[PDB]
């Protein structure tokens, strides 16, 4: 690597440039430094301040200043008019037309997604009292499917196999609840992913998936990448086809994990849902309680992209995106995906 | 497979109206507002945006008055969000709100909305209901117009579902309507470009006069090096030294340009972001440092085509030939029409015109980009060598052009500085216009990307340099916008006082909002609109929709 994103949490903050350094001040009193050598995007939260000289020094070094709301809602980027990233974009577009590029990254993404799913099985299995362990036949089955995904011949075969394995994971997803079937929170193994959520658990799953997709979109656009040109999913109709491509490994870690957190912590209850002729949707208070929960899961630290330094998830996303652009253009072969 | 998402039934409503409209709005995002879309949103918002009762799963006997009900069936392939559902117990009926009067047609409902209501009716039938009817509740006169789900109405609906599916999977945008009266109000006529694409695709007609642009404002220029732009709700107050210099209404602002060390409070930046009002940071001298973006532009076909054609040599070569031939032709035309001599010099020397036309044609027959760049250099050299011929009837005091001083960093002439400022301040306009149409302003076919100068704005500005930049410089010097006192020396070179910068920027703005007549389509169009129209036509040309890009030679 080269450097790391700097997150200016303090809404009080005032950021100046000190020669080769970026100085954070609080009330005319210093807080911390970045110093532009190991820097990446500078993320400014609500009503922080960035002196225009510091902004110009960021732009000249082609650093994607990003503006988040006070809470952390994304509001826009600020990119420089230099070839720093157009090289990355042209590499992405030139290489998306290739069969091994699409196929190889798709195989890696799917094997990582499956591995995260089975690791989450062995983490959060709550068939407690009599089945402390998941059926190792299931674990062997998912291992076999993982090898199959390693050696899928083409994209459509991989899509079919992916759908299969994800379904057989969701077969025991309800096995991971507070210990039994969640009567009042029913989970359907088959009505997955239809546009209106027909189950409360599926409503949570879809909402978490949408927020994860948004996070991945903004992280991808922070680096010089076009989120709407995917390698595995399909591009048009307004679908972010690269966020959808890359969020696959992170579905169990941030979406399934957030739902499990908020349902095993009693944050989400049967009274929070409204059902209408085939649609189960959250209530506003429940919606933003769940948004707070999604934050709390996005705030956790995990240590091992390939270098062990305990990043928050929201920065691990950028680390992965930079790793992707770095795989492209031929720095590091085969995009070392993040798997736990 | 996932080759196609579920068709929203509003796109089903649009497809039976204009298949190209459905393609634009659904397969490429690409929406824009006008009088009527805004008015319709205003009607729907105050009542049906907010939810109401649920459609009971177990229905025995009670009034159903659900509002904004979201269904979908994936056997059918459609998704809907019904405006309202009126049902007694187990016999429900969709109700769709509209905006205007009852139309003057048999049955009181046009073909599209009837199809939308029938589609929502089928969706309700899917979830275990008996609909066999619907209504259109026009908000303006609240004259509920019933619609009965006749059989071949359902035939039309399913046919339209299949037709939209096939036209989306094919990947070819259907042609525009033939001289229809629908188009002058479809709120995408500025993006469909119906008559222009008809005319250039050799379905030749005479392009009807510009369906004029609507609901777009003018830029905000912040040239003072000690300004402080802060938010004051919806206005945007620019205070300098703690006194309100001017206010800018955000509804009427279309861009923001921050020159030099002008500060923009983070709240003002957020408010600009919430409206996608582009904000562009520039050096004190006009260098284009950076701008603001927001998670890309949802149109992907445009960028995919742009890059895929960028990787094709002769497409790049043909485009570059067109561009610099247009540039040389415009240089010739400017040299003619604004040459100001006294006698035996008052009209252009034909030897120069011979050289310039021969260079035009030598470029038209160029073998590769190397020779093209060489010819562009030679022709621009001759043009600037004669450039001083024609301002104020000759050089004034200090207003001295040196033809050899062009094309490098610190301007050490007054008029060299003026030209460089105009160029670097037209590049911004082109970048904004190109990014507003879905293109990527940095991937260029002719130029190479380098800092501060996007490779595609530099390309498509080449025809427009003489018409906008050089013309603004000439008009500014001739009319007396700038005299020698306006400049200040510096170790670097020449620069302008603030009194000069404000006047020059005002002149450039007047040039951009100055109407012309298109050579090809022949209607009065402002230059700012013309940049957008040309960007859109480039998108169409790369799309393979039209045979060749219209270069705007005048």
């Amino acid at each position: 690597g080269r450097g790391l994103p700097l997150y200016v949490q303090s809404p009080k903050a005032y950021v100046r440039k000190d020669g080769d350094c970026l100085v954070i001040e609080e009330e005319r009193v210093r807080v911390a430094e970045a110093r532009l050598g190991e820097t990446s995007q500078v993320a400014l939260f609500g009503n922080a301040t960035l002196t225009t000289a510091a902004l110009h020094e960021c732009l000249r070094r082609e650093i994607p200043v990003t503006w988040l709301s006070y809470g952390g809602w994304f509001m826009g980027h600020t990119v420089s008019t230099g070839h720093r990233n157009v090289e990355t974009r042209t590499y992405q577009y030139q290489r998306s037309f290739d069969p091994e590029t699409c196929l190889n990254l798709a195989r890696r993404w799917i094997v990582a997604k499956i591995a995260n799913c089975r690791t989450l099985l062995r983490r959060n299995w709550r068939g407690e009292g009599d089945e402390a362990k998941a059926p190792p036949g299931l674990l062997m089955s998912l291992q076999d499917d993982m090898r199959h995904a390693m050696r899928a011949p083409s994209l459509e075969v991989l899509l079919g196999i992916e759908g299969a394995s994800a379904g057989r994971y969701f077969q025991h997803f309800s096995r991971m609840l507070r210990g039994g079937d969640g009567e009042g929170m029913g989970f359907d193994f088959t009505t997955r992913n239809r546009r209106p959520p027909k189950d409360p658990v599926n409503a949570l799953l879809s909402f978490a998936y949408a927020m994860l997709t948004r996070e991945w979109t903004v992280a991808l656009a922070a680096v010089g990448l076009d989120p709407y040109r995917g390698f595995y999913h399909q591009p048009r109709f307004g679908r972010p086809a690269l966020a959808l491509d890359m969020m696959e490994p992170f579905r169990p870690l941030i979406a399934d994990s957030t739902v499990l957190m908020a349902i095993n912590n009693g944050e989400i209850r049967t009274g929070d849902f409204v059902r209408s002729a085939g649609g189960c949707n959250l209530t506003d208070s429940a919606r933003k309680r769940f948004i707070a929960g999604f934050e709390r899961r996005m705030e956790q630290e995990v240590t091992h992209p390939i270098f062990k330094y305990t990043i928050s998830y929201r920065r691990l996303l950028e680390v992965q995106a930079r790793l992707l652009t770095r795989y492209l253009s031929g720095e590091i072969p085969a995009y070392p995906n993040f798997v736990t | 497979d996932g080759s196609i998402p579920l068709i929203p039934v509003r796109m089903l409503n649009e497809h039976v109206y204009c298949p190209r409209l459905a393609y634009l709005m659904w397969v490429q995002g690409e929406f824009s507002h006008n009088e009527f879309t805004v008015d319709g949103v205003i009607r729907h918002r105050r009542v049906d945006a907010g939810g109401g009762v649920l459609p009971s799963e177990t229905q025995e006997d009670s009034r159903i008055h659900a509002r904004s009900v979201s269904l979908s069936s994936e056997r059918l392939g459609i998704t809907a969000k019904i405006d309202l559902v009126e049902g007694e117990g187990a016999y429900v009926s969709p109700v769709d709100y509209k905006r205007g009067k009852r139309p003057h047609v048999a049955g009181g409902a046009y073909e599209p909305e009837r199809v939308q209501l029938c589609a929502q009716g089928l969706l309700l039938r899917e979830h275990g209901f008996a609909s066999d009817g619907g209504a259109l509740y026009f908000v303006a006169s609240r004259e509920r117009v019933p619609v009965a789900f006749d059989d071949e109405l359902i035939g039309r609906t399913l046919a339209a579902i299949d037709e939209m599916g096939r036209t989306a999977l094919s990947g070819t945008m259907p042609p525009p309507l033939e001289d229809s009266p629908k188009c002058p109000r479809c709120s995408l006529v500025g993006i469909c470009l119906p008559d222009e694409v008809r005319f250039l695709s050799h379905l030749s007609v005479e392009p009807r006069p510009i369906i004029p642009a609507d609901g777009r404002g003018l830029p905000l220029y912040v040239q003072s090096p000690k300004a402080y732009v802060r938010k004051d709700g919806d206005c945007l107050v620019i205070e300098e030294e703690r006194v309100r210099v001017a206010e800018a209404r955000l509804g009427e602002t279309s861009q923001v340009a921050l020159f030099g060390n002008a500060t923009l409070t983070t709240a003002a930046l957020h408010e600009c972001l919430r409206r996608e009002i582009p904000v562009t940071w520039l050096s004190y001298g006009g260098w284009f440092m950076g701008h603001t973006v927001s998670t890309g532009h949802r149109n992907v076909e445009t960028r995919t085509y742009q890059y895929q054609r960028s990787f094709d040599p002769e497409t790049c070569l043909n485009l570059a030939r067109r561009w610099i031939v247009a540039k040389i032709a415009n240089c010739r035309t400017l040299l003619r029409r604004n040459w100001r001599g006294e006698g035996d010099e008052a009209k252009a020397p034909p030897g120069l015109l011979m050289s310039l036309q021969d260079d035009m044609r030598h470029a038209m027959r160029a073998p590769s980009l190397e020779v093209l760049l060489g010819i562009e250099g030679a022709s621009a050299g001759r043009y600037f060598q004669h450039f001083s011929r024609m301002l104020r009837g000759g050089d004034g005091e200090g207003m001295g052009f040196d033809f050899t001083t062009r094309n490098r960093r610190p301007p050490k002439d007054p008029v060299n500085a003026l030209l460089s400022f105009a160029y670097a301040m037209l590049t911004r306009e082109w970048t904004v216009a190109l990014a507003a149409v879905g293109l990527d302003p940095y991937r260029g076919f002719y130029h190479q990307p380098r800092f501060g100068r996007p490779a595609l704005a530099l390309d498509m500005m080449e025809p427009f340099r003489p018409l906008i930049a050089d013309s603004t410089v000439l008009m500014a010097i001739n009319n007396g916008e700038i005299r020698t006192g306006d400049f200040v020396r510096s170790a670097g070179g020449c620069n302008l006082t603030d009194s000069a910068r404000k006047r020059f920027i005002a002149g450039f703005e007047r040039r951009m909002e100055q109407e012309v007549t298109h050579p090809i389509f022949k209607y009065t169009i402002s230059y700012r609109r013309l940049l957008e129209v040309q960007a859109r036509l480039l998108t169409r040309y790369l799309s393979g929709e039209i045979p060749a890009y219209p270069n705007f030679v005048t």
Binding site: - | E35, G233, D234
Partner: protein, 95 residues
């Protein structure tokens, strides 16, 4: 084509008055003690009447919107006795 609108209000609650003064500086320029002059095209007039149907309380407030003309020929239509009258001009802000 843009029109010149004159908007004059009576608001009987100081909070609603703040809300409306808010919105009106969003749209036009101050003219008189409770009057704004607005130069708007169609999209923006739709926006303004949308805003002032929820800012105000229809029971006891009163907002009046007058469409003088095509904003190019308004000067013969307006006669001011005290201060000068000068219509809103559509030009960029150079300062």
């Amino acid at each position: 084509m843009e029109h010149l609108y004159i908007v004059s209000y009576d608001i009987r609650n100081q909070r609603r008055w703040r809300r409306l003064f808010k919105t009106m500086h969003g749209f036009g320029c101050w003219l008189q003690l409770s009057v704004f002059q607005c130069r708007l095209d169609r999209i923006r007039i739709i926006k303004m009447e949308a805003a002032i149907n929820e800012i105000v309380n229809h029971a006891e407030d009163h907002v009046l919107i007058l469409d003088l003309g095509p904003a190019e020929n308004v000067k013969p239509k307006v006669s001011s006795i005290g201060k000068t009258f000068d219509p809103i001009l559509r030009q960029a802000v150079i300062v």
